[PDB]
Structure 1
């Protein structure tokens, strides 16, 4: 039998046979009291104890969401929808462990993305089963509340203070600090890593004083808090929740009364008016997300970073080649996953229309000018590949690079990567290229499974990425081997050296999209 005593009681797991070895999994362990009606919107409250032996043999419920319905049956959009049944009773975590039991293993904890409006820890692509076998690490992933249930903000009010989903993540980190040693883990060798909103969440735990002693290092895949979508100001967050109050018919006059209504509305009706809280939305809009709550975040995050008020620690940051493409099929005119989606100049301007609603026409025009210096002026996809770069450069790449630059200026080693390989099984058309969120499959080592129809070169690349991610976790250095391996240098604001990741050849280069990033950091703000 497979049992282990937690500070909250005993829990039993299951054996899995992987690559000829065995990995022990504990799926759906509760870490906080169910945030049911009274506690809804409150911070997660700590567990007491449970009866008998919890069987952690099945993924738990996903926290409440809307689902991607745009293309039914399509694996590309379906793979990101929650694969468990959805509920407010949803604060659970998973633990994968190498067998035989490790004495003092390093722990990796995954924080899923999804724009702070979706996500779950039970997707196939987040299966930690492999990482535990290949590199003998302990992998933990947790469900955190998302959407209005997770980040409704009336700061100063304990009934709905904002940043609850972040406080869900934080208490899960506290649980690992309290328990993972029983599992054979090292609570002082703990590395956070997430993608998109998960990477943004990871970046903010570096700022929050409460998380400064719950983890050792951080990995940020295609996300950082200084992205335009990550953090919303204090009073637009409140303007958002006052609007949701009316939309649901319970604008009352003193705040705790308005939460009293929202606690009695079924989770659905809250979920289907989350989208009307903003007057002018883009495909990349975060209606209810992180905010400056005065508890998790004591100031606007860009300031905290500029003043060095953060955890001093190694970080591994990176991005994909075509991060913007995934969002154009979700509103940009002329774009479809079933075309090759070659647009014309006016369709391009109508695209900026969508992604930059409140920007002046002089500002749109300057964005166009900076991305229209065609090296070859006869190729149609010029305007198609331009807007995908605009969306990706402004929302992911240039903030991630700018965050690393500012972070490295305070004396801690930073390593930047540029993921350039398109998966052989990518169900989207290839005009979308190396898409957002499609490096995760290689991070978790899915191409190591031989029965999955991945190429041999994709297994080699996945085997490499996995070794470097785990080596960064254990040692703070993303090496692969001492010999026969391209050395990954540190990112420092002068040379700005990054490492490319693909199947042809990994090599060192400098100043990633520096001519494009200069526009977004030094000219677009003044517009």
Structure 2
């Protein structure tokens, strides 16, 4: 199977899926490899080739540091890159139903990883099931991460910032220009992503350059208003200069700094990324999105508040235990290998780990709000997880959804509370950050892979709801006497719970906690 694109022919491969066939094109280039003089610059447009490009295997993942905290452990290692690392990493993947569809809706995945890690080739992002079951087309792309993708010297096109976001945008443009050739509808494209990928999705809603490039958006566990998601101009400058110093590239002509950094091997840059800040936390994002005056024209909180974004439908949600994953990467008393019953004192030391630059009054106020118990030994353990999850993910997602819906668009919010039966992390960590993803991509539909019957059922319905949102803008499951998903409005704030047992309509998720984080805490 061979498809003619604008820049040349590509050959794909046939896959067998559920007694049917899916056609996969893995590793199509969408930009000039950003090497040599091109490192740190916006992605440059592609050449044009005369032969047939073999797209029959995942391409290189972008350069990045790897998680080495738990060698041999599937829980952490499943997120590590499964393909060679290289600066030559600007490639995308396409899954298509067989027989070739005529005008199929397109789903474009953007992975998360704190803007420092990630790759589109992970097992949990395999689009072949969505293509097989719902007959949509699935696209995913690799984008630059870390300093290589987000190094900023505002105004300087040698390193203007936001390069990884421009990588994403160029791929959306590739779909606009080429997807009809694959049987897709360029007028029916839904972006979806998780964590930093969801933050990216929300930023595409704000970038005027992305507005004509997609129809609707889905945000899983992330939004730009999260405290880790956008780096200030002040922080970005101090970090760029710190990087230059650590690598011996401190100069006076800022452009000369960039030249010096271009002569360093990727490993020396990667090695020094962790130290551009005096203290980090498990949620540190040293090189992330900035206000560059190009992709992002002003502080995004201002744009959101004043209604300056694409007017369309959104689907947003979070998991029950967003915060727990991070506790075992530094908080004292914690371990994936015991029940982590911590003391008041340990909770206090824990806040210092996650809020290192915050005043003593600020840390006390967190403790006051989360430690009025009604006693129970796991009180402090659970409080710290909730602190981390509410501050970093849930409260920002809820505030994003309210502000967005106030300008008249339909929004739908979910609360995912099912813990995978195959979860390799201990049960005290609950419904973890990142563990709805395999349900969305329909992994439990494969009966050969250890999931329960109830989980097959949950994933099937989730897959249908996501597909109906992309196609029709309304995430219902209309056939099997399902609970109707009500629109989220700023007054009533209805949301839908996703679980194996009882799907329910609820109101005002974490009302009391979020009043603390959203209204008060930004003042300390």
Shorter-chain TM-score above 0.5:
yes
Q: Distance in 2 between matches of 1:429 and 1:280?
A: 28
Equivalent position of 2:255 in the other structure: 256
Q: Distance between the aligned counterparts of 2:447 and 2:309, measured in 1? A: 42
SS of the residue 1:237 aligns to = helix
Tell me the distance in 1 between the aligned counterparts of 2:115 and 2:4: 33
Assess, with a 3 A threshold, how the Cα gap between structure 1 residues 483 and 454 changes in structure 2: closer, same or farther.
Answer: closer
**d(CA) in 1 for partners of 2:128, 2:373:** 46
What displacement does 1:227 show? 0.2
SS in 2 for 1:380: coil
Residue 346 of structure 1 and its aligned partner are, at CA, apart by: 0.5
Task: Report how far residue 165 of structure 1 moved.
Answer: 0.1
Q: CA deviation at 1:48?
A: 1.5
Q: Secondary structure at the match of 2:37?
A: coil
Residue matched to 1:180: 179
* 1:525 to partner: Cα distance: 1.5
Tell me how far 1:183 sits from its aligned partner.
Answer: 0.3
How many Å separate the matches in 2 of 1:259 and 1:51? 35
Q: CA deviation at 1:358?
A: 1.3
Q: Deviation string for 1:186-217 (max 9, x for gaps)?
A: 00100000000000000000000100000000
Displacement after TM superposition at 1:235 (Å): 2.2
- Structure 1 residues 77-117: Cα deviation after superposition (integer angstroms, max 9, x where no partner): 00000000000000000000011000000000000000000
How do 1:146-295 and structure 2 match up within 5 A? 146-295=145-294
Considering only aligned residues, what root-mean-square deviation do their CA atoms show, in Å?
0.7
Q: For 1:128-527, what aligned pairs fall within 5 Å after superposition? A: 128-375=127-374, 378-481=375-478, 484-527=481-524
Cα offset, 1:526, TM superposition: 2.0
Provide, for residues 353-393 of structure 1, a one-character-per-residue CA deviation record: whole Å limited to 9, x for no partner.
00001111111111111111223xx2111100000000000
CA distance in 1, matches of 2:50, 2:266: 28
- Displacement of 1:482: 5.1
- CA distance in 1: counterparts of 2:50 and 2:327, whole angstroms: 50
Q: CA deviation at 1:276?
A: 0.3
1:459-499, CA deviations, whole angstroms, 9 ceiling, x for partnerless residues? Answer: 00000110000100001000111561100011111000100
Q: Distance in 2 between matches of 1:86 and 1:357?
A: 32
In the alignment, the residues of structure 1 paired with residue 461 and residue 372 of structure 2 have an alpha-carbon distance, to the nearest angstrom, of 36
Cα distance in 2, alignment partners of residues 117 and 123 from structure 1: 16
Structure 1 segments unaligned to the other structure (5+ residues): none
Superposed CA deviations along residues 401-446 of structure 1, whole A, max 9, x for unmatched, are 0000000000000000000000000110111100000000000000
Report the count of equivalent residues.
Answer: 524
SS at match of 2:212: coil
Cα distance, 1:50 vs. partner? 2.0
> CA–CA distance in 1 between the matches of 2:181 and 2:84?
30
- Residue 280 of structure 1 deviates from its aligned partner by 1.6
User: CA-to-partner distance for each residue in 1:122-169, whole Å, 9 max, x for gaps?
Assistant: 000000000001100000000000000000000100011000000000
Structure 1 consecutive aligned stretches of length 4 or more whose deviation exceeds 4 Å: none
Q: Unaligned 5+ residue runs, structure 2?
A: none
SS in 1 for 2:328: helix
SS state of the match for residue 428, structure 1? coil
Q: Distance in 1 between matches of 2:68 and 2:518?
A: 35
Q: Determine helix, strand or coil for the equivalent of 1:352.
A: helix
- Give the TM-score normalised by the residue count of structure 2: 0.99
Distance 1:31 1:220 in 2: 24
**Secondary structure class of the residue paired with 1:330:** coil
